[PDB]
Amino acid sequence: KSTIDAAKSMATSVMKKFKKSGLANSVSTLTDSLSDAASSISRGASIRSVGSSASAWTDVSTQITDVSSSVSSISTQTSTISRRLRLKEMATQTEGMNFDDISAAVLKTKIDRSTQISPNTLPDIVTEASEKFIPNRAYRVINNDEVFEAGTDGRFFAYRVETFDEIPFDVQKFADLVTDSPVISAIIDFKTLKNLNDNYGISRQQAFNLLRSDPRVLREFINQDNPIIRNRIEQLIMQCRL
Amino acid sequence: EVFEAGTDGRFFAYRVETFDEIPFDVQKFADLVTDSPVISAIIDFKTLK
Amino acid sequence: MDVLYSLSKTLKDARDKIVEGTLYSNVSDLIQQFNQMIITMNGNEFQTGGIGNLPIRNWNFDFGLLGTTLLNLDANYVETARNTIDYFVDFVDNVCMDEMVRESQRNGIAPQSDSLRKLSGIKFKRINFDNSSEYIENWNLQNRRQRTGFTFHKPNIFPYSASFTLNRSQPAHDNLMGTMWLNAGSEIQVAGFDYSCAINAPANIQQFEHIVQLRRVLTTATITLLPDAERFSFPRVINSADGATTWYFNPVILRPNNVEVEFLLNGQIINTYQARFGTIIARNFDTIRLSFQLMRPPNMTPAVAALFPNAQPFEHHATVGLTLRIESAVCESVLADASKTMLANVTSVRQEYAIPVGPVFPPGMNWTDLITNYSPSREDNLQRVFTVASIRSMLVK
Amino acid sequence: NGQIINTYQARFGTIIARNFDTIRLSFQLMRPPNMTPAVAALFPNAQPFEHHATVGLTLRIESAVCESVLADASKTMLANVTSVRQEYAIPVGPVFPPGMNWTDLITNYSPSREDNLQRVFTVASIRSMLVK
Amino acid sequence: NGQIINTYQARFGTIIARNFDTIRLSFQLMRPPNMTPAVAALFPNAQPFEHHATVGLTLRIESAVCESVLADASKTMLANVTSVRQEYAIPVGPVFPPGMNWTDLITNYSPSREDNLQRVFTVASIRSMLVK
Amino acid sequence: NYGINLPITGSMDTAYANSTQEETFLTSTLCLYYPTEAATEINDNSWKDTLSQLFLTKGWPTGSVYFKEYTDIASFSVDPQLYCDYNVVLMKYDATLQLDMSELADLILNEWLCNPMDITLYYYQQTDEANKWISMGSSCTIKVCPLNTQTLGIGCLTTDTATFEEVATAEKLVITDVVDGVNHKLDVTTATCTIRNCKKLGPRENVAVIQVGGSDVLDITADPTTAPQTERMMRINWKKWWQVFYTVVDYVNQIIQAMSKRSRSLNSAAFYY
Amino acid sequence: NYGINLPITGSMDTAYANSTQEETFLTSTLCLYYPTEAATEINDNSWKDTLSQLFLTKGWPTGSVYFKEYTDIASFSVDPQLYCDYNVVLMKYDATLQLDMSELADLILNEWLCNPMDITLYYYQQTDEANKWISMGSSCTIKVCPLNTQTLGIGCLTTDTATFEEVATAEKLVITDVVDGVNHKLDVTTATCTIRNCKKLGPRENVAVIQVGGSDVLDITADPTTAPQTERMMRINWKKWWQVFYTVVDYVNQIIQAMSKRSRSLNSAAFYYR
Amino acid sequence: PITGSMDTAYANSTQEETFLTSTLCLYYPTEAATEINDNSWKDTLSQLFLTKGWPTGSVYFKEYTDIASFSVDPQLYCDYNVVLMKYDATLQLDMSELADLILNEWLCNPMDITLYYYQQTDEANKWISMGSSCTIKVCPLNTQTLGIGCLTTDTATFEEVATAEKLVITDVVDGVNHKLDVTTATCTIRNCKKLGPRENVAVIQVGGSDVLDITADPTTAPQTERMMRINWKKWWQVFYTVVDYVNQIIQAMSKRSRSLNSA
Numbered sequence A: 001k002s003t004i005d006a007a008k009s010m011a012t013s014v015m016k017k018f019k020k021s022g023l024a025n026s027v028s029t030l031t032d033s034l035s036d037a038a039s040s041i042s043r044g045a046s047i048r049s050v051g052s053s054a055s056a057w058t059d060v061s062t063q064i065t066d067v068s069s070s071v072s073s074i075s076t077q078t079s080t081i082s083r084r085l086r087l088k089e090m091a092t093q094t095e096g097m098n099f100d101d102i103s104a105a106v107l108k109t110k111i112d113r114s115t116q117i118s119p120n121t122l123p124d125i126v127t128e129a130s131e132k133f134i135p136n137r138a139y140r141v142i143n144n145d146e147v148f149e150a151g152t153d154g155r156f157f158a159y160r161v162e163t164f165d166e167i168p169f170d171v172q173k174f175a176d177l178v179t180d181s182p183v184i185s186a187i188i189d190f191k192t193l194k195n196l197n198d199n200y201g202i203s204r205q206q207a208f209n210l211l212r213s214d215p216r217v218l219r220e221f222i223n224q225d226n227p228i229i230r231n232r233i234e235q236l237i238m239q240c241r242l
Numbered sequence B: 001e002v003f004e005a006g007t008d009g010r011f012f013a014y015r016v017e018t019f020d021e022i023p024f025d026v027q028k029f030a031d032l033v034t035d036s037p038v039i040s041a042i043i044d045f046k047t048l049k
Numbered sequence C: 001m002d003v004l005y006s007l008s009k010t011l012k013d014a015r016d017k018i019v020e021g022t023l024y025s026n027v028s029d030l031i032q033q034f035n036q037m038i039i040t041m042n043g044n045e046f047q048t049g050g051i052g053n054l055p056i057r058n059w060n061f062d063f064g065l066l067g068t069t070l071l072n073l074d075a076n077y078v079e080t081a082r083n084t085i086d087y088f089v090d091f092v093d094n095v096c097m098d099e100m101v102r103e104s105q106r107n108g109i110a111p112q113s114d115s116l117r118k119l120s121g122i123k124f125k126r127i128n129f130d131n132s133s134e135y136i137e138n139w140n141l142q143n144r145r146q147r148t149g150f151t152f153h154k155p156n157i158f159p160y161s162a163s164f165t166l167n168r169s170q171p172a173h174d175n176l177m178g179t180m181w182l183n184a185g186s187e188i189q190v191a192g193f194d195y196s197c198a199i200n201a202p203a204n205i206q207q208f209e210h211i212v213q214l215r216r217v218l219t220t221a222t223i224t225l226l227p228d229a230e231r232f233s234f235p236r237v238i239n240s241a242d243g244a245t246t247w248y249f250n251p252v253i254l255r256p257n258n259v260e261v262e263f264l265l266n267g268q269i270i271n272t273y274q275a276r277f278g279t280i281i282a283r284n285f286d287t288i289r290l291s292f293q294l295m296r297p298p299n300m301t302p303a304v305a306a307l308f309p310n311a312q313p314f315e316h317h318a319t320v321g322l323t324l325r326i327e328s329a330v331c332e333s334v335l336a337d338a339s340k341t342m343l344a345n346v347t348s349v350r351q352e353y354a355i356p357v358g359p360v361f362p363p364g365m366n367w368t369d370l371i372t373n374y375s376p377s378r379e380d381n382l383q384r385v386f387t388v389a390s391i392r393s394m395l396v397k
Numbered sequence D, E: 001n002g003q004i005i006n007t008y009q010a011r012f013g014t015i016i017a018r019n020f021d022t023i024r025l026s027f028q029l030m031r032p033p034n035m036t037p038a039v040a041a042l043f044p045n046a047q048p049f050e051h052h053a054t055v056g057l058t059l060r061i062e063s064a065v066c067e068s069v070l071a072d073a074s075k076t077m078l079a080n081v082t083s084v085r086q087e088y089a090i091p092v093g094p095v096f097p098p099g100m101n102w103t104d105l106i107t108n109y110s111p112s113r114e115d116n117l118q119r120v121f122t123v124a125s126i127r128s129m130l131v132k
Numbered sequence F: 001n002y003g004i005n006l007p008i009t010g011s012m013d014t015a016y017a018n019s020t021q022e023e024t025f026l027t028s029t030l031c032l033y034y035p036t037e038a039a040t041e042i043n044d045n046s047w048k049d050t051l052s053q054l055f056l057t058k059g060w061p062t063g064s065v066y067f068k069e070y071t072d073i074a075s076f077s078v079d080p081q082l083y084c085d086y087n088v089v090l091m092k093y094d095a096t097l098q099l100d101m102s103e104l105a106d107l108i109l110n111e112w113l114c115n116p117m118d119i120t121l122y123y124y125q126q127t128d129e130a131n132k133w134i135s136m137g138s139s140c141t142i143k144v145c146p147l148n149t150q151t152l153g154i155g156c157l158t159t160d161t162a163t164f165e166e167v168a169t170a171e172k173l174v175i176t177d178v179v180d181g182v183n184h185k186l187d188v189t190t191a192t193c194t195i196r197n198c199k200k201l202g203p204r205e206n207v208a209v210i211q212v213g214g215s216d217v218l219d220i221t222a223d224p225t226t227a228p229q230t231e232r233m234m235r236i237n238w239k240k241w242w243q244v245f246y247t248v249v250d251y252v253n254q255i256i257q258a259m260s261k262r263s264r265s266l267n268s269a270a271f272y273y
Numbered sequence G: 001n002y003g004i005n006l007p008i009t010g011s012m013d014t015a016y017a018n019s020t021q022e023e024t025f026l027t028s029t030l031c032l033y034y035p036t037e038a039a040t041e042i043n044d045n046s047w048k049d050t051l052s053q054l055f056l057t058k059g060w061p062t063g064s065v066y067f068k069e070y071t072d073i074a075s076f077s078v079d080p081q082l083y084c085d086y087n088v089v090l091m092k093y094d095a096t097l098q099l100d101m102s103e104l105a106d107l108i109l110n111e112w113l114c115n116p117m118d119i120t121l122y123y124y125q126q127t128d129e130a131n132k133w134i135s136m137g138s139s140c141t142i143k144v145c146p147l148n149t150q151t152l153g154i155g156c157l158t159t160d161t162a163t164f165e166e167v168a169t170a171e172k173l174v175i176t177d178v179v180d181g182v183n184h185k186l187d188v189t190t191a192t193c194t195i196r197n198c199k200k201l202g203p204r205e206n207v208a209v210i211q212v213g214g215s216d217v218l219d220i221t222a223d224p225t226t227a228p229q230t231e232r233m234m235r236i237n238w239k240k241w242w243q244v245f246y247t248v249v250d251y252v253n254q255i256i257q258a259m260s261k262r263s264r265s266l267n268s269a270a271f272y273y274r
Numbered sequence H: 001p002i003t004g005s006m007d008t009a010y011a012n013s014t015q016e017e018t019f020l021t022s023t024l025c026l027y028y029p030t031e032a033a034t035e036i037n038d039n040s041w042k043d044t045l046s047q048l049f050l051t052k053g054w055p056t057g058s059v060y061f062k063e064y065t066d067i068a069s070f071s072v073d074p075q076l077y078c079d080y081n082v083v084l085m086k087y088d089a090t091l092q093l094d095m096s097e098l099a100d101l102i103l104n105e106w107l108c109n110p111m112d113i114t115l116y117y118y119q120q121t122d123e124a125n126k127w128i129s130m131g132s133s134c135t136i137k138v139c140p141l142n143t144q145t146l147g148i149g150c151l152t153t154d155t156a157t158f159e160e161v162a163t164a165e166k167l168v169i170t171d172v173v174d175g176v177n178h179k180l181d182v183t184t185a186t187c188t189i190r191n192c193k194k195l196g197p198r199e200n201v202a203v204i205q206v207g208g209s210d211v212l213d214i215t216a217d218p219t220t221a222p223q224t225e226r227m228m229r230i231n232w233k234k235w236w237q238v239f240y241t242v243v244d245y246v247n248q249i250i251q252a253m254s255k256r257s258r259s260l261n262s263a
């Protein structure tokens, strides 16, 4: 409501906030890191390419690796390779409910269910929502029935598109298959999945969808069944707390 | 199973192959509509059968 | 079913009593039984698996008998035997597992799998033998409709329940009175608290009570009862009943006064103990009632007097408690306990083979959910499934 | 081996872990968003912090199966072996830690210690059929 | 057992409930959004509230199957057992409530009461084949 | 209510309906009590207004807050009819008025139940550590005479008040305490005073006496044995009055959270019977 | 459990508990409010006393009943400090003072919640059919000026009160009502008046305004649509004042029964208020 | 992070590293020394300090003559600083503001009152100003850079929150911009963020019934170990006690980790 050319220049101000924040610059970086990759010359502040060859996404992260100490190798790259893999990629191309689409939902929700929202506040708050929503989260890439899961921050696994399974995970096989293929915003991840597959019983049919993070098949359960699924979901809402 | 919400009036239920009128369900309808892809039935039953 | 049993004790008493050396005479009675089997089997054909991630496997039979000739046993004799056993082992495993997954509402007691349904057939009954395995022992006695019974160490009769009840409360939660508890497995801990230390209570005594209703009767129970609930003897910040805020619990413990434990059966007191801590026997009960009081100390040294003022704020919260543990007991119904692997075996086979949730058991064979709504169907299915797990563990662990 | 075999989210009571070599417990302390005065008083915006917020978990393995011999709360094997050695003043050898110390043994449970332990446990069990 | 086996939304008339131990009826009173004067007059914005808005439901189990014996509107078993006991001034026993009171019996339908009831109902049915 | 009987459920669902400050911002009222000197030092015709806009920051809608001016601890003590949902009263210790202050705190910070006393016709008796005589007015002067079990004086003649024992000489608020379980002929100066028999108890889930000055301690206990320190008893370090108010505003919620509404359905809490 | 959290389950034990009047005779107080003219017509120095002995008949112990003298409907309508458990107020029909009477009834017969208003610094607005402005004092004169969504007058200049709209000219009790959801700069004569913002809640389980004379009315609804008639609103046919009191005494219980316990004051409360 | 393994291996002593390696600086007021009236008091106490275990060249004696000057100049010289404060009842707060500074760890930046109107961010962002005569007037700005109860143009409409103090920790409603008007000629005002406390000072208070507030809010009251109190008799007695209990006082403090860029 109200909006005397507020939500207006404000839908514009909400803009004039975005292009000056987390999501902004970051996306503006990956972009260059490609141009500057092929085009000019790879700013070699040390650079690796865990995978076939150089390609911003994989490598530029494979290298850099700033501000994350106290554990094991893999995790650190995975992580730093997550950072762009995630967020950054989303504002581009992918399937099923994409994290943010769970976020937007949070916003268009409260920003209506609220009472304390004058125009001045509209900006920022929206922006800030992006930078601080679903602190972490991971992704996956299927290829020959092999769920490769870059559990951002920490963790990482693999699966048979059929039986699921803690099969060798490799910074390599990972490298490429990530770089240029479609990714998936793993709504529900392993933990919830394996626990789900057992005390329960996921038809090959379903499962195959529960990966692409299909809207339907997911909606079903949460709507129908109600076991676990209703936490992996909910917990996320609770996470987009900002 | 072609579920056809003939707006205003009508509603029919097929069997995607050898077409066939058959019990239409406000229920089975409910959901399968809510969250799945729909289709702007260019040609509908009448013309089709 | 009983059929099944034999198949194993056959193999066990086999893979056990048959070795490079011993005299024939010690197995004569055995050897026979064995062969008898091979015969009845040979010619028949089977099928196991087909559900979830469980492989489908077909089995056929065409085996030679056993040399009832020899005096002693030569190495060669064994190896030619062990080779035949290993096919049956790998068989039974697949048989058990296949019937250890299927559930059924109507008749959740009888066999399910194509594999077993075929066994209950009459033509195979020619194999039963030595039913001393505690579980089968009780499986039979139940068919003939008679008094069964099992043995358990730290039984698992209490569904997990951790909560509180505020008998006196107010928004600030600065002068509460009530109880908090943890019922889980074979143990109960309950504390009664009164922020006012019974300052305005009749006889300066606040009465507390905790009642726990078992889903099945336990007989012959050996129980440890101790004063105090250590679990509720430390400072806590707890969520309010409505979840809208949090309250502070800062306990100071006093001895529970006029402790009375009653083990009731259908509303009748079967056993009652007044302030008796240590080991007590409850011979038959479906309910436990713990009554205890907080009595304001009539005489207090300065340090104590300082904790209990005549007026708020009440900063030290008088608490009395009890701890009760059922070490062992007998139940006419199967239950999970702290020693038997049955529940874990059934749950594990289902998890490993990605068996879909069925119509009888709660997702994941969740114990709390199971015991909370322990219907006749769940019990019949559980017993069938536990008995099969026990048959399997005679050969495969 | 790094793979999640069983996972439980906030499930207290009895749970089954069918095959594992590692247990990982993750839990959080969340500052109460709403606090009565008594609670608010424990958690000021500035130090000194006099009441220390603590969250915890307790996990007990009631029963399990292991492919290797182990000491447990019911079997007398370890105690039998340890007792015979102590009674006869048997000198420390090259395999077992002094006094058959369980913690030391399980901490560095080498193949040699396990093979010797199994041999020694099996003999203790043979002995207990006649002599207790 | 806590699971929805059958659910019906606003369906009046004849419905089938195939297996259940609990019935839950949920319904609402919705203030009429449009009211003629006569209706508007019954529902003022302020007290006194003199006409009390009421919504309701009626549910009747015409027939069903039960694995346990029960009294119903056609069988004379309960009446036979109760009648023989009353006629012969049979003293109250340890199992059945005074007068074979149905409400008391079904309220605390213990295994013992059910086994005794079944035995006693089966005998009543044997008797009614010859003596009515 | 109508309901207390039949206990709540203690199950630890463990959900905590987030916030609580967002309901109080919308639905409650905040009343600030200060002394004249406080406002005089501020010297602005718009201070109440400026602070109000500043109060929107902390989340209180325009028509929400207020400002009530007591000019002395003595006057503020007697005709205190706490006006709003939440009352935070500013007191700047004055060292000679300490007990005046103590008696006033004892009244606001606590929940009181009173009945009227007829000093003229009846000879009465204080019952427990919670039965006190709270008198207040223009000039309260109370003389007492303890009676033995015969209606006879003990160190006094129930006939001549010149033998009575004076326990209050012209105060504006007085909470009198006598040896429990003893009858006393009372002689108050009812012309300028009113004395009522009160039973104590419930505290106040509102006030928040914020103390300015000194090295402040208060002793609600009429006894010697106890000393209660509550959250609704805060203290601020004196610099200037503008600073005091800035802080009160900058920490409104913190101060409100130490109280908590829901306890305020009476004009004045001199509960009448 | 105090937390005004509620549950209760109505099994029909059907223990119809007996009397009710024998708890009120022992534990409660009855306060009779009348006008001066009432007592003046009685002309006895012992009327309060005689009636009191007569009150023992109906079952009220000596020290139980109190007699409060309002001399006018305007003054009585002022501080309203109902003294006793049960208050039955006698109102003599003065036809010119009808609304004065209506405004006073509306206050006693009902449960009110108020906050203070600062006419000086903040222009207010009423929220629902239950948010009213009750002002009272020596001489209450209220002028109002409706504000559009800019803080600008509508038919007035928020600057000169000579353009305001007068809605009360020197009353002793006034319940003002303005178009809901509109801000108003208010101009009361705070010198002699006090105006407070009240939200109407529960009703009163005490008063029992007994009306002498007319044919009668006194409607307490601000709207036109509703007319509520409660039990705590009784009427008596005037003859002589002695007769009125005799009747009030001869039917004390009947009158008390139409009121009873003043629920908002009942001990048993908490989150609901006292 | 440190490994958490517990197996007890007490260090034994602690005080024998501090006796050897650290300095102790005693701050007192002039009146304190004047009452002592000896040309060798600093010396006598020093020999007495060897008893408690502090080598000759170890202990230093700094003379503040007032709480106001000391409050400005707390360029704490030694490893351990124990400051003696005299209960002056009119100066209480001055004392509070000085305690708040020594007892705590502060981070500050400079403020240009002339060109940029500021705002405090959290319960830890305060404006600490100090000098000859500190007089601070403030004017709150609405979201337009316009006054609220003031004209950003005439300081005669500002709100005075400090009239000529020697040390002032000013607090304004968080999240609001303010045009500030300090008397920069004699004052310096800097924007500080609080935090870490001080593992040194040990304000020892002489006299009163010494309880005093050190929080800006009303809700909290923090009582730390580095805040001690002694009963006044004579100054010689005070010092004897400080010496007789040096270690006890030192133990209530103990060497800093601040990686403070100011040094």
Ligand SMILES: [Zn+2]
Residues within 6 Å of the ligand: C154, C338, D073
């Ligand atoms: Zn045990």
